[PDB]
Amino acid sequence: EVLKPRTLADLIRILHQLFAGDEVNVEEVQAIMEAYESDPTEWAMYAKFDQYRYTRNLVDQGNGKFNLMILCWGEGHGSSIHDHTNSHCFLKMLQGNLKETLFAWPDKKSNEMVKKSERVLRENQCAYINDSVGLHRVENISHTEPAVSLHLYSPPFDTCHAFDQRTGHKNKVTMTFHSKFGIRTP
């Protein structure tokens, strides 16, 4: 019963429709992103890796309503524990596997941060998070293979917080793009 995009281009077109209004049906977006069968012939132009850290590669600016990007995780690469600046966040596997670790939010007190959930995102699976769900950290499960994920944020945001797992203290972080529309950035 779910609308199945046949290409990454179909998916983008559907997303433009589902985010045209004021109401976002989270479960419907998630199902449609999941239904798209990752095809590396369609997204290899965005798959630009770096040796030391994961890269963020803008695919579509979603008419200001959302950002759609591809994240490329080298061998062993992982993220910090971060929030999502009051946005919706969808992340779909395109290649390999990510481990998502969900954390509880810290208090004012300093303390080791608490894990609320731990899972591996399967092939083509679409996960969802926002700040009310919790914080998370995401990482390539593999030290011999890369991972590639498709992320949708609505509204778009260019800053978030990184969290120290030992204390819960946080720092503001400005996120950058490694490339946009297949073109490397400065």
> CA-to-CA distance for 31 and 14, rounded, in angstroms?
12
84 is in an annotated binding site: yes
> CA-to-CA distance for 148 and 14, rounded, in angstroms?
21
136 is in an annotated binding site: yes
Helix (H, G, I), strand (E, B) or coil at 127: strand
16 is in an annotated binding site: no
At residue 123's C-alpha, the angle toward residues 165 and 61, to 5°, is 75
Structure tokens at 131: 């700040």
Q: Are 176 and 75 in contact (CB under 8 A)?
A: no
Cβ count near 33 (within 10 Å): 25
Residue spans of beta strands (DSSP E) within the chain: 55-60, 67-73, 81-82, 88-95, 98-103, 115-121, 126-129, 135-140, 147-154, 159-163, 170-174, 179-180, 183-184
Residues marked as binding?
82, 84, 136
Residues marked as binding for Fe cation?
82, 84, 136
